[PDB]
């Protein structure tokens, strides 16, 4: 069986709030950054 | 322990393999259409077949072998199949809409008439009529198969089901031959477009339907069905009637009225 309770019903860990901040930063940051880099990609092709 | 009658399904990998196989097939179609390669498509079709095979195998294991299909579970599966068929009906509706739109207001490029100038339609009284008698006949034989199963008659259920399948195959072979013989092609304007895409998707459904019936035939051979519990057969029969009704609309609309 699986772990249950606050902080245990999720695919990411919230054991360390700083490691968590790193996770969330990469997660949400990669999403927000993607369009900018795709725009850069399109501009650097021609 | 649970005190409800519903099915708590074991964690399964098939939803993921199925989703990935969808990515491989669409990626694959793109590679084929634009980068002249069928590698991705081949892998996609293979993992798709493997996913469906294992997923449905597990459903049989959960029901026939483990007894998880209580009346409540079976009731839900009934709604599920009816809903699926409804969405299939709406899919075809889009193709019929395209057909009527084009045929009721023939544009000047067609000669302002329907069928377009240069198009020589198949005779609806020849193979298309035969195809119609074939599917209607299979609708009768599958009903005999259903009653035989309910009456606990194994031999006649198998016999009727075999006849139903043979008829579906006959239709498929006839259609394949008609496709080859047709003087018009999919590239012959909107007439060929509507004709081949609509009858083509219908032919695909006949193949899917026949396969479903074949699965039932072998599950029957293996004594999976009881005279009272045989949802797989019921679903296959509902799907088969759907395929039959879509053909009747195609026959009347495209082959007859549209000629």
């Amino acid at each position: 069986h699986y772990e249950e309770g606050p902080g245990k019903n999720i695919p990411f860990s919230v054991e360390n709030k700083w490691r968590l901040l790193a996770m969330m930063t990469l997660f949400f940051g990669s999403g927000f950054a993607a369009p900018f880099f795709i725009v850069r990609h399109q501009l650097l092709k021609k | 322990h649970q005190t409800h009658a519903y099915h708590m399904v074991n964690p399964s990998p098939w939803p993921l393999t199925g989703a990935l196989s969808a990515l491989l097939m669409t990626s694959g179609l793109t590679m084929w259409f634009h980068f002249n390669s069928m590698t991705l498509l081949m892998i996609g079709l293979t993992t798709n077949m493997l996913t469906m095979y294992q997923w449905w195998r597990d459903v049989i294991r959960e029901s026939t072998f483990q007894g998880h299909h209580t009346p409540a579970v079976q009731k839900g599966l009934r709604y599920g199949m009816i809903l699926f068929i409804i969405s299939e009906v709406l899919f075809f509706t889009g193709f019929f809409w395209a057909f009527y739109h084009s045929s009721l207001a023939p544009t000047p490029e067609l000669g302002g008439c329907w069928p377009p100038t240069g198009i020589h339609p198949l005779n609806p009284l020849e193979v298309p009529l035969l195809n119609t008698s074939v599917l209607l006949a299979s609708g009768v034989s599958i009903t005999w198969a259903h009653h035989s199963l309910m009456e606990g008659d194994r031999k006649h259920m198998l016999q009727a089901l075999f006849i139903t399948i043979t008829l579906g195959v006959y239709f498929t072979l006839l259609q394949a031959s008609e496709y080859y013989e047709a003087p018009f092609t999919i590239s012959d304007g909107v007439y060929g477009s509507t004709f081949f895409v609509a009858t083509g998707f219908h032919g695909l459904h006949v193949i899917i339907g026949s396969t479903f019936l074949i699965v039932c035939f072998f599950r029957q051979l293996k004594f999976h069905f009881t005279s009272n519990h045989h949802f797989g057969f019921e679903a296959a029969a509902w799907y088969w009637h759907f395929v039959d009704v879509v053909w009747l609309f195609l026959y009347v609309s495209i082959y007859w009225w549209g000629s």
Binding site: - | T107, P108, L110, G111, G112, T117, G118
Partner: protein, 79 residues
Amino acid sequence: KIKNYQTAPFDSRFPNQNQTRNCWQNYLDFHRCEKAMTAKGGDVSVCEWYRRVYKSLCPISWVSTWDDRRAEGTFPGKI
């Protein structure tokens, strides 16, 4: 003669925003009439009205394409 045409008048047969058929019809009519007159020994001046109307309504590229096709033998319409 019974002319003095400004532009193609309202035609009750084609009263809506889509005027595609109006152009098509008149183009057909002119070429059918022109063929009948050139054949039976008569004058194409009777086909004038249709010529003026289709000329007024039909995009130049349409008329040009249709003309090219009638010459090529690939015009889909009946003339």
